């Protein structure tokens, strides 16, 4: 019922507005943003992901800044950022999910909240990573 997209746009919510909390706990602020009108089973979903990201935050920025070409991870905006951590983990973490359709997601999010360059670059980096990272079984999707 409540879309696996909508799902996971509250996670990236969380990342993004954690980036102004950082003395508070990305938990805190994604159960402020789950509320009612969030099935049982995406407030599962969103806490699985809150919860992988932060245990896995070093290694996945690591990571992408592997895959930088230009500016590093500090310097690019809290949108680009956030939405390679996400997909990111997703990519490494989420079995169910074709590398196409993290990756299509994750552009969109960047397409409607980053510049207009964001997408673009988001897709390149994330082609980049999950040829590479992608569990070998998700070749199969």
Same mark, same amino acid.
């Given at each position: ?19 102004? $909390? ?14 009612? /009108? ?9 806490? $699985?992901?809150?919860? %992988? ?11 992408? &800044? ?5 500016? &590093?991870?500090?310097?690019? &905006? ?11 983990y997703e990519l490494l973490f989420?079995? *169910?999910?074709?590398?196409?359709? /993290? ?11 980053? /510049?207009?360059? &964001?997408?673009?670059?988001?897709? %390149?980096?994330? *082609? ?8 070998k079984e998700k070749f199969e999707?």
């Amino acid at each position: 019922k409540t879309p696996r997209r909508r799902m996971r746009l509250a996670v990236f919510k969380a990342l993004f507005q954690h980036e102004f $909390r950082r003395d508070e706990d990305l938990e805190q602020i994604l159960e402020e943003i789950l509320d009612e /009108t969030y099935d049982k089973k995406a407030k599962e979903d969103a806490r $699985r992901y809150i919860r %992988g990201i932060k245990e896995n935050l070093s290694m996945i920025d690591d990571l992408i &800044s592997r895959y930088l070409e230009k500016w &590093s991870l500090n310097r690019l &905006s809290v949108v680009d950022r956030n939405v390679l951590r996400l997909a990111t983990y997703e990519l490494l973490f989420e079995k *169910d999910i074709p590398i196409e359709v /993290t990756i299509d997601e994750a552009i969109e999010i960047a397409k409607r909240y980053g /510049t207009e360059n &964001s997408g673009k670059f988001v897709n %390149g980096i994330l *082609d980049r990573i999950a040829k590479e990272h992608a569990p070998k079984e998700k070749f199969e999707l």
